[PDB]
Structures are given as structure tokens and as C-alpha cells.
Design a protein around this ligand. Sequence first.
Ligand SMILES: [Zn+2]
Ligand SMILES: [Zn+2]
Ligand SMILES: [Zn+2]
Length: 178
Amino acid sequence: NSNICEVCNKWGRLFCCDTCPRSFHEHCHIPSVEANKNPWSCIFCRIKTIQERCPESQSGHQESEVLMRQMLPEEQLKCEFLLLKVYCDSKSCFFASEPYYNREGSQGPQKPMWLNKVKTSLNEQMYTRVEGFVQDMRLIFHNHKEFYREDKFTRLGIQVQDIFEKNFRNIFAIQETS
Ligand SMILES: [Zn+2]
Ligand SMILES: [Zn+2]
Ligand SMILES: [Zn+2]
């Protein structure tokens, strides 16, 4: 197994996957690494299994159909993974915790949103459809773009949103287009 957390790339108290070489801090993994279970498989392995059980799940889909899906266990897992993939980029640090807005010439967003809040919302089963999760995630980046206006700091919102969107297209097997 790896000697660093797959998500934050740091050593510490790691839990090891029994079916792949990845390792995780307890709260870097999503969901949090489970108390018992021997063996244990990480979310990368769990997602791989879904694909292997149903190869046709990788055929292209329409985003509009994916968003209307009910958060049944497999979609719950897929959203958890997608959130994890965003946390894997170090630039997610800017969007993790609850922001505040006090900048000359800007107003704060009507509906603040951050990654830890989405994490909690997933954990407490507050989303009934994929749409709820995806809207909140896009809101994070949209609020940022809007607030930072012409400051070059806006680019961080663009960069992290590109990570989100690519992983969203991959995990939910959205039909490739130009
Ligand atoms: Zn970690
Ligand atoms: Zn694994
Ligand atoms: Zn099948």
C-alpha cells in the first residue's frame, strides 16, 4: 500500500485498502473510513465494481437524464466519489470551508456554498436527486467567479470547476461531444 493519503498526499494515521494499494486518512475518504469491515475496499474499488458488474453503465448518457436520477445507493456513491475527486486537487482548499465576503466593490452571494457543507449534506442524505448535489457543487464555483470579478483569483474557480466537470463526465459516463 501507499505511505501517503491518496486525497491529501500526506502521511499520518492511514487506513489501507484491501483490494488496491491506496491509503486514506479517516476523514479524507468519503464516506469516512468504516469502523470494522475486514477486508475493506475504498471508494475507488467500489466504483470499479459497479462498472464491472454493469459494463453498459459506461455507455454515453444525457446530462439531463443523469441529474433527474434519484439518489439510490449507487448514485449516492458516485456523488461521494466525485466530491472526493475534487478534494484530491490541492486547490480545493480554497473552497472547503465556509467563506466570507468583504471586498470593496463586490457583494457576497445570496447563497454561500462550500465543499464541507456539501460533504455534510451527502452524509446526512439531504439530496434526493443527483441534480441537488450537482447544483450545489456548481454554485461553489459560480459564487466565486461572480464575487472575484476581474481579480485573477477568479481563475481558481475556473480551475477547480474544470476538475469537477471532467470527473462528473467520467463518473456518470456522459456522452462525449464537441
Ligand atoms: Zn488525507
Ligand atoms: Zn481500493
Ligand atoms: Zn448488466
